[PDB]
DNA sequence: TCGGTAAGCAGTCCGCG
DNA sequence: GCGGACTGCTTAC
């Protein structure tokens, strides 16, 4: 097989590399890598190395990496560009793996671990590590085993061994319900003392050294706690055995508010699953507890135990260990679904970077572009310092707040990357500038043609047309990968809808789910067999289809994120290829493109309708337009349609056969106008929205920019079994809105769009009457909590104190003295409730850690003093009043001549 | 939050005769 | 009471 790296490090003048050799074995080597860097040289000197602008360079070979680094410094001292890859491990990887890397994941040791630490005096701080580590569960991907290290004797109590028999049993048998599929994979090791446990853990680690190290909050808790505890008991050298090269750094993580400390383990790639989840999931969650996220992702119940976690080991050690094991497994289950580790490996090996660098799109793209240029013997420029400067972004149309009955939306495929490719925007393709007219003049095609030679953006920039820039070349490659995975995602989605349809008529039989590839549209043969399947098999197929859709979503959305990040990186001062001329060339072209096509679509539809100056495009944001289709429907007449699906078909056909050709024509003209390299503005129909045929549903409404709701029957060619609400920006979509309120507001919107005003009034009346019964957590607001200390003046709110911070301060005063009280962690999320006047907390609100029940000693008082009226008006009524006034509807029945008469 | 801009709403402070 | 000048937070792209 072809070799591939696992990890790479620079330690002084040595590269330390762990890799898989040509026989599939894991090896480690120390390499005295001699780096090269570059200086400009005279043209009269013969060379094969050129910078990106075509200027000749001489290669400088250094005796070692420190010499190379010193040379960079002296070149700065002289005032001359020091060209080349200054991150020497990236150059090493480029030299050592000069081909597209094919990796074998089965050879990569992925370790998932979690530790437990009993602490009677609050949160066990990783920097202090003053409490014994009393449990470690460490799952190894190569052995496919859970290695359980269990401390039986502690200063906080001596316990009996954990029982695998009880662990397996149902919670109704007094057991812990450790999943049957992992029971046989547990290797249980009890220890009579902590020193023995840790020494054995280190010997184990030495034997089975993680390449990828993950788990939940491992980077901020488990890793620094283990490191520091071993350091405290044994000394630093023993703690450094967590690094295969025995090198670590206590590294400070800084942002804006403060700083925290993590431990860098050289020769390990830490991908904390919480960080993977935050980067790759495209969710914003009210809580990031593993319980909370496992419930969201897997629909598994919260791990139930009695009393505080600080007493769980002594009171129920059996459950303590079982929950430690289950916790490790939950992360594995989340990964089986989301496939973020797979994603990270894919992107890391593609870029030829340390796997953990996938968190940095700037590092990722720097390596991609470097490797690409190096193939042509081209030489990358030195990174430079730039002051942070603001620059313009997208255009967003101001909508008229209103109901909108029939709506067809259209959206440009991968806009910013497509602009880059179309215009040929790259550091080395800049050809010059032209004299800019107001943007409006380009939109309306009255400005002079920018260039007859170069490819242009309406920000004034011109680009070469003779050859693709490196940025267009490399962005195209990832765009193509993205396109493939999106295809699989959409097929799985369409396939899921077939199954949902079939589930209306389940067959009464015992059978099996079909063995199919959900990434490809079901054949007629499959469709016929599905129509004969039982509900049990159908539901299993649906679950599998949706799992396939999730896998495709992960693969596509994050490749989209990477390519959009390249467009964004051009406007980040830390990017080697930072250039506001290029960043703005992209955003300004986008502004023109949207407004250009708004004009074209309005012109086309006014033509087919035989009107003048009518506004068909009601809205647009960045790269999308929303077209009113009322007149199109009305041209055939509602009564002519058999059912909802009939007008949906008609609009779909109209969009594809009439509107899309007109859209393409408009964009080809714009391409010629800007003299672009290649027409890539592809705007396809996205949504077809409207009320159910013959109903009083309003179909949709806008309240303002980035705030709307649509009843969608077809999205990107997925025809839904049941209509789906597309809601953007409204409170139902915000993590800050209480859970039960999101749900209620969603149902109000559903009723408005599908059923009408009367249905809405019926539901409002009911919610208003019953809501005080809702669980306090479900009606709590949520907020991130930054700068708590900043607004704290002797335990009370300082000037300008935010509402949620006030709640935290109220909480802090209420828990002064309570030993079992959780602390609010700076920068994390909190639940927030309003409090009625004259409450014993002495303020108008209280806040506590999100994803948790409020501590028992104040819970009863909070419940008693919760201000339901304020809660209702602020989270439910105010937003609903916003929705209904926009839609010209009333959520309460107004008086009529029938009232109180006949 | 260690890792692009536009723009919405909550809330504080305080004017607005 | 609402709206502007702010801070804070969160979402649409
Ligand atoms: N830097 C950055 N830009 C974004 C992000 N989301 C959207 N944009 C910008 C770049 C996109 O091309 C443009 C339009 O956003 P869309 O959500 O429609 O995505 P896009 O057109 O790229 O892909 P698509 O084919 O429609 O799924 O807005 C983002 O998360 N980060
Ligand atoms: Ca735990
Ligand atoms: Ca788009
Ligand atoms: Ca059937
Ligand atoms: Ca869009
Ligand atoms: Ca098309």
- Helix, strand, coil share of chain A (percent; to 5): 45, 20, 35
Q: CB of A586 within 8 A of CB of A425?
A: yes
A765 and A780 part of one domain: no
User: ω before A82 within 30° of 0 (cis)?
Assistant: no
Is the CB–ligand 1 distance for residue A478 below 6 Å?
A: no
Query: How many other β-carbons are positioned within 10 Å of the β-carbon of residue A498?
Result: 20
Question: How far apart are alpha carbons A514 and A591 in whole angstroms?
Answer: 48
A463 CA → ligand 5 middle, Å: 26
CATH of the domain at A702: 3.90.1600.10
Q: If we measure between CA atoms, which residue out of A710, A708, A704 comes closest to residue A397?
A: A704
Question: How far apart are alpha carbons A351 and A371 in whole angstroms?
Answer: 8
A706 CA → ligand 3 middle, Å: 15
Question: How far apart are alpha carbons A612 and A418 in whole angstroms?
Answer: 33
Question: How far apart are alpha carbons A199 and A217 in whole angstroms?
Answer: 23
Q: If we measure between CA atoms, which residue out of A715, A593, A747, A615 comes closest to residue A666?
A: A593
Question: How far apart are alpha carbons A186 and A164 in whole angstroms?
Answer: 9
Q: Is the CB of A785 under 7 A from strand C?
A: yes
| A413 CA: nearest ligand 1 atom | 25
A70 and A1 part of one domain: yes
Q: Which residues of A58-72 are buried (b: 16+ CB within 10 A; e: fewer)?
A: ebbebebbebbbebb
Q: If we measure between CA atoms, which residue out of A449, A416, A411, A457 comes closest to residue A433?
A: A457
Residues bordering ligand 3, an ion, CB closer than 5 Å: A 411-412, 623
**Where are the alpha helices (H) located in A169-316, listed in sequence order?**
180-183, 194-207, 223-234, 236-239, 273-280, 290-298, 312-315
Q: Is the CB of A623 under 7 A from strand C?
A: yes
Pairing between β-strand A617-620 and β-strand A259-265 as defined by DSSP bridges: unpaired
Q: Which of A351, A382, A413 is the last residue of a domain?
A: A382
Which nucleotide comes closest to A570 if you measure CA to C1'?
B4
Is the CB–ligand 1 distance for residue A622 below 6 Å?
A: yes
Is the CB–ligand 1 distance for residue A412 below 6 Å?
A: yes
Q: CB of A759 within 8 A of CB of A738?
A: no
Q: Is A158 contained in some domain?
A: yes
What letter does residue A728 receive in the DSSP assignment?
E
Question: How far apart are alpha carbons A530 and A537 in whole angstroms?
Answer: 9
Question: How far apart are alpha carbons A36 and A1 in whole angstroms?
Answer: 29
Q: CB of A702 within 8 A of CB of A400?
A: yes
Contact positions of strand B to protein Cβ (< 7 A): 1-13
Nearest protein CA to atom 4 of ligand 1, as residue: A564
φ/ψ (deg, to 5) at A680 = -135, 10
**Where are the alpha helices (H) located in A146-265, listed in sequence order?**
164-168, 180-183, 194-207, 223-234, 236-239
Distance in Å, residue A299 CA to nucleotide B1 C1': 29
A282 and A175 part of one domain: yes
Q: Is A28 contained in some domain?
A: yes
Mutate to test the pocket of ligand 1, among A393, A410, A415 (most ligand atoms within 8 A of CB): A415
Q: Is A478 contained in some domain?
A: yes
φ/ψ (deg, to 5) at A664 = -60, -45
Which nucleotide comes closest to A726 if you measure CA to C1'?
C12
Give me the count of residues in chain A.
902
CATH of the domain at A183: 3.30.420.10
DSSP letters spanning A607-618: HHHT-SS---EE
What tokens were used for A753? 């769009």
Distance in Å, residue A800 CA to nucleotide B16 C1': 21
Q: CB of A828 within 8 A of CB of A822?
A: no
A513 and A627 part of one domain: no
Ligand nearest, relative to CA of residue A305: 2
Beta bridge partners of A848: A831
Q: If we measure between CA atoms, which residue out of A857, A846, A779 comes closest to residue A809?
A: A846
Question: How far apart are alpha carbons A308 and A754 in whole angstroms?
Answer: 47
A515 CA → ligand 4 middle, Å: 18
Ligand nearest, relative to CA of residue A225: 2
Distance in Å, residue A704 CA to nucleotide C10 C1': 16
CATH of the domain at A545: 1.10.287.690
Nearest protein CA to atom 27 of ligand 1, as residue: A414
φ/ψ (deg, to 5) at A10 = -95, 125
How far is C-alpha A820 from the geometric centre of its chain's CA atoms? 34
CATH of the domain at A770: 1.20.1280.300
Q: Which of helix, strand or coil describes residue A337?
A: helix
Question: How far apart are alpha carbons A483 and A461 in whole angstroms?
Answer: 29
What tokens were used for A756? 């009408």
φ/ψ (deg, to 5) at A704 = 175, -175
Question: How far apart are alpha carbons A335 and A83 in whole angstroms?
Answer: 41
Q: If we measure between CA atoms, which residue out of A146, A119, A139, A140 comes closest to residue A131?
A: A119
Specify which residue's alpha carbon is closest to the C1' of nucleotide C12: A706
**Where are the alpha helices (H) located in A570-673, listed in sequence order?**
580-609, 630-636, 644-654, 660-673
Is the CB–ligand 1 distance for residue A415 below 6 Å?
A: yes
- Per the listing, tokens 């969710």 go with A283
Which nucleotide comes closest to A832 if you measure CA to C1'?
B10
Q: Is the CB of A729 under 7 A from strand C?
A: yes
A658 and A699 part of one domain: yes
Residues 6+ apart with CB under 8 A from A563: A414, A416, A417, A475, A478, A479, A482
Q: If we measure between CA atoms, which residue out of A392, A444, A410 comes closest to residue A681?
A: A410
Q: Which of A729, A750, A765 is the last residue of a domain?
A: A729
Q: Sort residue A414 into left (φ over 0), alpha (ψ -120 to 50) or beta.
A: left
Is the CB–ligand 1 distance for residue A411 below 6 Å?
A: yes
Q: Which of A278, A310, A339 is the last residue of a domain?
A: A339
Q: Is A567 contained in some domain?
A: yes
A592 and A620 part of one domain: yes
A413 CA → ligand 1 middle, Å: 9
Q: Is A804 contained in some domain?
A: yes
Cα dihedral value A799, A802, A804, A810, nearest 10: 10
Nearest protein CA to atom 21 of ligand 1, as residue: A414
CATH of the domain at A65: 3.30.342.10
Which nucleotide comes closest to A362 if you measure CA to C1'?
B3
Distance in Å, residue A734 CA to nucleotide C10 C1': 7
Is the CB–ligand 1 distance for residue A623 below 6 Å?
A: yes
Q: CB of A826 within 8 A of CB of A258?
A: yes
Is the CB–ligand 1 distance for residue A564 below 6 Å?
A: yes
A76 and A167 part of one domain: no
A19 and A90 part of one domain: yes
Ligand nearest, relative to CA of residue A509: 4
Q: If we measure between CA atoms, which residue out of A749, A713, A715 comes closest to residue A731?
A: A749
For A735-839, strand residue ranges (E) read: 781-784, 792-793, 796-797, 829-834
| A394 CA: nearest ligand 1 atom | 28
Distance in Å, residue A872 CA to nucleotide C1 C1': 20
Is the CB–ligand 1 distance for residue A116 below 6 Å?
A: no
Resolution of the coordinates, Å? 2.0
A325 CA → ligand 2 middle, Å: 9
Question: How far apart are alpha carbons A472 and A570 in whole angstroms?
Answer: 13
Ligand nearest, relative to CA of residue A560: 1
Helix axes A415-423, A535-569, angle to 10 degrees: 50
Is the CB–ligand 1 distance for residue A413 below 6 Å?
A: yes
Distance in Å, residue A800 CA to nucleotide C6 C1': 10
Is the CB–ligand 1 distance for residue A534 below 6 Å?
A: no
**Experimental technique behind these coordinates:** X-ray
Q: Is A899 contained in some domain?
A: no
A160 and A305 part of one domain: yes
- Per the listing, tokens 């607001």 go with A781
- Domain residues for A486? 469-572
Residues 6+ apart with CB under 8 A from A580: A389, A391, A570, A571
Question: How far apart are alpha carbons A32 and A34 in whole angstroms?
Answer: 6
Is the CB–ligand 1 distance for residue A414 below 6 Å?
A: yes
Q: If we measure between CA atoms, which residue out of A554, A86, A638 comes closest to residue A347?
A: A554
Q: Is A898 contained in some domain?
A: no
A203 CA → ligand 2 middle, Å: 24
What letter does residue A693 receive in the DSSP assignment?
T
Residues 6+ apart with CB under 8 A from A343: A280, A358, A554, A555, A558
Q: If we measure between CA atoms, which residue out of A399, A328, A414 comes closest to residue A590?
A: A414
Q: CB of A160 within 8 A of CB of A321?
A: no
- Per the listing, tokens 């942002």 go with A255
A83 and A164 part of one domain: no
Question: How far apart are alpha carbons A826 and A785 in whole angstroms?
Answer: 6
Is the CB–ligand 1 distance for residue A97 below 6 Å?
A: no
- Per the listing, tokens 């992107």 go with A347
Q: Which of helix, strand or coil describes residue A259?
A: strand
Q: Is the CB of A203 under 7 A from strand C?
A: no
Pairing between β-strand A461-463 and β-strand A718-728 as defined by DSSP bridges: unpaired
| CA R_g for chain A | 31
Contact positions of strand C to protein Cβ (< 7 A): 7-13
Which nucleotide comes closest to A621 if you measure CA to C1'?
C13
Q: CB of A611 within 8 A of CB of A387?
A: no
Question: How far apart are alpha carbons A341 and A724 in whole angstroms?
Answer: 31
Residues 6+ apart with CB under 8 A from A480: none
A587 and A707 part of one domain: yes
A364 CA → ligand 3 middle, Å: 23
Residues 6+ apart with CB under 8 A from A196: none
What tokens were used for A735? 């993590």
Is the CB–ligand 1 distance for residue A416 below 6 Å?
A: yes
Q: Is A900 contained in some domain?
A: no
| A415 CA: nearest ligand 1 atom | 12
A766 and A846 part of one domain: no
Q: CB of A808 within 8 A of CB of A821?
A: no
Q: CB of A297 within 8 A of CB of A140?
A: no
The total number of structural domains that make up chain A: 6
Q: Which of residues 372-431 of A touch strand C (CB under 7 A)?
A: 394
| A416 CA: nearest ligand 1 atom | 12
Which nucleotide comes closest to A707 if you measure CA to C1'?
B8
């Amino acid at each position: 097989m072809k070799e591939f790296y696992l990890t790479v490090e620079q330690i002084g003048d040595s590269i330390f590399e762990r890799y898989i050799d040509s026989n599939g074995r894991e090896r480690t080597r120390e390499v005295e890598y001699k780096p090269s860097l570059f200086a400009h040289c005279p043209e009269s000197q013969a060379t094969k190395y050129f910078d990106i602008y075509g200027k000749p360079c001489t290669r400088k070979l250094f005796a070692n990496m420190r010499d190379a680094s010193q040379w960079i410094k002296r070149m700065e001292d002289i005032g001359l560009e020091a060209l080349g890859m200054d991150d020497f491990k990236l150059a090493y990887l480029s030299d050592t793996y000069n081909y597209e890397i094919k990796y074998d994941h089965t050879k990569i040791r992925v370790a998932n671990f979690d530790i437990e630490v009993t602490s009677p005096d609050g949160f066990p701080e990783p920097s202090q590590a003053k409490h014994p580590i009393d449990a470690i569960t460490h799952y190894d991907s190569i052995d496919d085993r859970f290695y359980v290290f269990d401390l039986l004797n502690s200063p906080y109590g001596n316990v009996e061994e954990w029982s695998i028999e009880i662990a397996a049993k149902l919670q109704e048998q007094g057991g812990d319900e450790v999943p049957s599929e992992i029971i046989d994979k547990i290797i249980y090791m009890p220890f009579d003392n902590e020193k023995e446990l840790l020494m054995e853990y280190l010997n184990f680690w030495q034997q089975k050294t993680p390449v990828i190290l993950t788990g939940w909050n491992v980077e901020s808790f488990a890793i620094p706690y283990v490191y520091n505890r071993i350091k405290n008991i044994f000394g630093e050298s023993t703690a450094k055995r967590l690094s295969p090269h025995r090198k670590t750094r206590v590294k400070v993580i800084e942002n804006m508010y403060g700083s925290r400390e993590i431990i860098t383990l050289f020769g390990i790639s830490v991908l904390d699953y919480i960080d993977l989840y935050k980067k790759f999931s495209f969710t914003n969650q009210p809580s990031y507890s593993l319980d909370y996220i496992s419930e969201f992702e897997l629909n598994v119940g919260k791990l139930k135990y009695d009393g505080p976690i600080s007493k769980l080991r002594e009171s129920n050690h059996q459950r303590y260990i079982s929950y430690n094991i289950i916790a490790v497994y939950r992360v594995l289950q989340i990964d089986a679904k989301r496939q973020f580790i797979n994603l990270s490996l894919d992107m890391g090996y593609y870029a030829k970077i340390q796997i953990q660098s996938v968190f940095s799109p700037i590092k990722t793209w720097d390596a991609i572009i470097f490797n690409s240029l190096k193939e042509q013997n081209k030489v990358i420029p030195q990174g430079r310092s730039h002051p942070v400067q603001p620059y313009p972004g997208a255009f967003v149309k101001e909508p008229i707040p209103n109901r909108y009955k029939y709506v067809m939306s259209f959206d440009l495929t991968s806009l910013y990357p497509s602009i880059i490719r179309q215009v040929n925007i790259s550091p080395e393709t800049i050809a010059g500038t032209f004299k800019v007219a107001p943007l409006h003049d380009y939109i309306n095609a009255v400005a002079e043609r920018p260039s007859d030679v170069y490819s242009c953006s309406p920000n004034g920039m011109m680009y070469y047309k003779d050859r693709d820039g490196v940025v267009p070349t490399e962005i195209t490659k990832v765009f193509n990968q993205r396109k493939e995975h999106k295809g699989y995602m959409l097929a799985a989605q369409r396939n899921g809808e077939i199954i949902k349809e079939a589930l209306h008529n389940p067959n009464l039989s015992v059978d099996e789910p079909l063995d199919v590839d959900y990434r490809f549209d079901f054949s007629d043969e499959i469709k016929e067999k599905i129509k004969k399947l039982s509900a049990k098999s159908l539901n299993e197929m649906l679950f599998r289809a949706q799992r396939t859709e999730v896998a495709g979503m992960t693969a596509q959305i994050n490749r989209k994120a990477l390519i959009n990040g390249l467009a964004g990186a051009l406007g980040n001062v830390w990017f080697r290829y930072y250039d506001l001329r290029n960043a703005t060339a992209i955003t300004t072209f986008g502004q023109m493109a949207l407004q250009w096509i708004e004009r074209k679509v309005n012109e086309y539809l006014n033509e087919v309708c035989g009107t003048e100056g009518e506004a068909f495009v009601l809205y647009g944001d960045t790269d999308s337009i929303y077209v009113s289709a009322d007149k199109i429907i009305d041209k055939v007449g509602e009564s002519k349609f058999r059912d909802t699906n009939h007008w949906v078909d008609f609009l779909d056909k109209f969009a594809r056969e009439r509107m899309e050709p007109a859209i393409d024509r408009g964009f080809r003209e714009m391409c010629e106008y800007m003299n672009n390299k290649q027409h890539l503005m592809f705007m396809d129909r996205e949504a077809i929205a409207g009320p159910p045929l013959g109903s009083k549903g309003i179909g949709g409404f806008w309240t303002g920019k980035k705030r709307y709701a649509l009843n969608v029957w077809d999205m990107e060619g997925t025809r839904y079994a049941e209509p789906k609400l597309k809601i953007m920006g409204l409170e139902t979509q915000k993590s800050s809105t209480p859970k039960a309120v999101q749900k209620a507001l969603k149902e109000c919107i559903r009723r408005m769009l599908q059923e009408g005003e009367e249905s809405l009034q019926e539901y409002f009346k009911e919610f208003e009457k019953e809501f005080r019964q809702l669980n306090y957590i479900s009606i709590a607001s949520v907020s991130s909590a930054n700068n708590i200390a900043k607004y704290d003046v002797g335990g009370f709110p300082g000037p300008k104190c935010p509402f949620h911070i006030r709640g935290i301060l109220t909480y802090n005063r209420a828990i002064k003295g309570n030993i079992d009280a959780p602390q609010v962690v700076e920068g994390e999320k909190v639940y927030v409730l309003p409090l009625r006047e004259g409450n014993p907390f002495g303020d108008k609100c209280i806040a506590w850690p999100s994803g948790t029940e409020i501590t028992d000693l104040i819970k009863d008082d909070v419940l008693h003093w919760m201000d339901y009226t304020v809660l209702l008006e602020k989270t439910f009524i105010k937003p609903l009043e916003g929705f209904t006034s926009a839609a010209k509807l009333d959520y309460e029945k107004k008086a009529s001549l029938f009232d109180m008469f006949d």
